[PDB]
Design goal:
Elements lengths: L5 E4 L3 E8 L4 E8 L5 E4 L19 E10 L4 E12 L7 E13 L10 E4 L15 H8 L6 E5 L2 E6 L7 E9 L7 E2 L1 E6 L2 E2 L12 E3 L6 E4 H14 L7 H4 L5 E4 L11 E6 L5 E7 L1 H4 E3 L8 E6 L1 E4 L3 E3 L1 H4 L2 E6 L4 E7 L11 E7 L10
Parallel strand pairs: 3-8, 4-7, 15-23, 16-22
Antiparallel strand pairs: 1-2, 1-10, 2-3, 2-6, 4-8, 5-6, 6-7, 9-10, 9-24, 11-25, 12-15, 13-14, 13-18, 16-23, 17-21, 18-19, 19-26, 20-21, 24-25
Bound molecules: the ligand CCNc1cc(C(=O)N[C@@H](Cc2ccccc2)[C@H](O)CN[C@@H](C)C(=O)NC2CCCCC2)cc(N(c2ccccc2)S(C)(=O)=O)c1.
The site of the ligand CCNc1cc(C(=O)N[C@@H](Cc2ccccc2)[C@H](O)CN[C@@H](C)C(=O)NC2CCCCC2)cc(N(c2ccccc2)S(C)(=O)=O)c1 has 23 residues, from strand 3.
Membrane topology: Single-pass type I membrane protein
Protein name: Beta-secretase 1
EC number: 3.4.23.46
């Protein structure tokens, strides 16, 4: 009943059906591990099919406080309150939770995305206005018996499993990396390889100034230095074809005659994550089918066209949806760790498969955390 409860794509977000208020108002809500506010469109907007009508909910309580939330893409402002919330295809519970009723926004809502709100699944430390606004999942755990864990299989569609791990959603072993600090889902990258060749940087550079696991961001985003080095290595591996600079910056598409995308000219990318034991790690391996994001457009449909879904960041590494796709990712809040396994909807062709493998050991005793 919880399997296949997500819909959406990397480019516009994955969303789960929820209800808010009494009687229940159905809304589609984007699942975002990169923020901590639960918010819903609560006034008309050109891109909203529907919105939260507070006047129709007898259980709504106004908190008499405004809130402003800026993301890397988009921003909104609204009014804080609480109300009853359910998840039809999740655990069969009703919880009273904080809700931001979005009354104005800028470049937040996306035309044709099919979602009307956002579920920030990260910790109170990054909630707005401040950490006294209890996030939804904290409320869910406090008010119900639900174990303090959820998992995401992003495949479009996929699954969010609340309170547990569904073995039918992965194969092989789950490998865990520590949550370094409970704010974002902050992790530590210890090594990066492109087609098995080490980028050969001080590992702190990979985590400058943090590294996060963020289902709400489309791309793998990398600190400038790491991004520049990664692109150089990917260009070199793929040098049998030459692409415009705009492609490498994510500003223009690359297109091939339908069915002829040359996957084998593009390298695999391995991100090594800190293990749960000193100087041990494991790797997750990303295929080009993950980091070249298809852009569906009937107009270009004589071809398959893609955007390069690795991009630069000035706020640290963001392991976005294109990285999470094809892995089963367990947000094990109870044990302050994040587990990765190969997903039942993994990417592969006949030559290569995405992987989660270990253990690996390092001689260098440097702490890779930036601080
Ligand atoms: C899914 C829509 N595509 C997209 C979204 C975001 C993004 O900012 N996602 C936020 C949620 C969201 C979802 C849908 C529409 C708009 C926004 C995430 O919460 C961001 N998480 C972190 C990084 C964050 O900013 N947390 C905030 C939370 C509030 C408190 C303060 C911290 C970034 C980029 N990408 C992008 C686009 C433009 C510029 C930079 C990145 S991309 C193209 O690189 O994937 C692309």
């Amino acid at each position: 009943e919880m399997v296949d409860n997500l819909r959406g794509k990397s480019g516009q977000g994955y969303y789960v059906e929820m209800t808010v208020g009494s009687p229940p108002q159905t809304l589609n809500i984007l699942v975002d591990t990169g923020s901590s506010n639960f918010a819903v469109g609560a006034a008309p907007h050109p891109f909203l099919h529907r919105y939260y009508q507070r006047q129709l909910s007898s259980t709504y309580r106004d908190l008499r406080k405004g809130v402003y939330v800026p993301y890397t893409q988009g921003k909104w402002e609204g009014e804080l309150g609480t109300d009853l919330v359910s998840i039809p295809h999740g655990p069969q519970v009703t919880v009273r939770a904080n809700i931001a009723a979005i009354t104005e926004s800028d470049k937040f809502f996306i035309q044709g995305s099919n979602w009307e709100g956002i579920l920030g699944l990260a910790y109170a430390e990054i909630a707005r206005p401040d950490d006294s606004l209890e996030p939804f999942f904290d409320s869910l755990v406090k008010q119900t018996h639900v174990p303090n864990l959820f998992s995401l299989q992003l495949c479009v569609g996929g699954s969010m499993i609340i309170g547990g791990i569904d073995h039918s959603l992965y194969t092989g072993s789950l490998w865990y990396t520590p949550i370094r600090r409970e704010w974002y889902y902050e992790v530590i990258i210890v090594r990066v390889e492109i087609n098995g060749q080490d980028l050969k940087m001080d590992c702190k550079e990979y985590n400058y100034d943090k590294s996060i696991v963020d289902s709400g961001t489309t791309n793998l985003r990398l600190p400038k230095k790491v991004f520049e080095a990664a692109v150089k290595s990917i260009k070199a591996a793929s040098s049998t074809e030459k692409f415009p600079d705009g492609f490498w910056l994510g500003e223009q598409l690359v297109c091939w005659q339908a069915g002829t995308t040359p996957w084998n000219i593009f390298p695999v990318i391995s991100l090594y994550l800190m293990g749960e034991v000193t100087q041990q790690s494991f790797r997750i391996t990303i295929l080009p089918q993950q980091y070249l994001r298809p852009v569906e457009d009937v107009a270009t449909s004589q071809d398959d066209c893609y955007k390069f879904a690795i991009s630069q960041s000035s706020t640290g590494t963001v392991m976005g949806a294109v990285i999470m796709e094809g892995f089963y990712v367990v947000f094990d809040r109870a044990r302050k760790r994040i587990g990765f396994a190969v997903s039942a909807c993994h990417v592969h062709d006949e030559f290569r498969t995405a992987a989660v493998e270990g253990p690996f050991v390092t001689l260098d005793m440097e702490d890779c955390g930036y601080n």
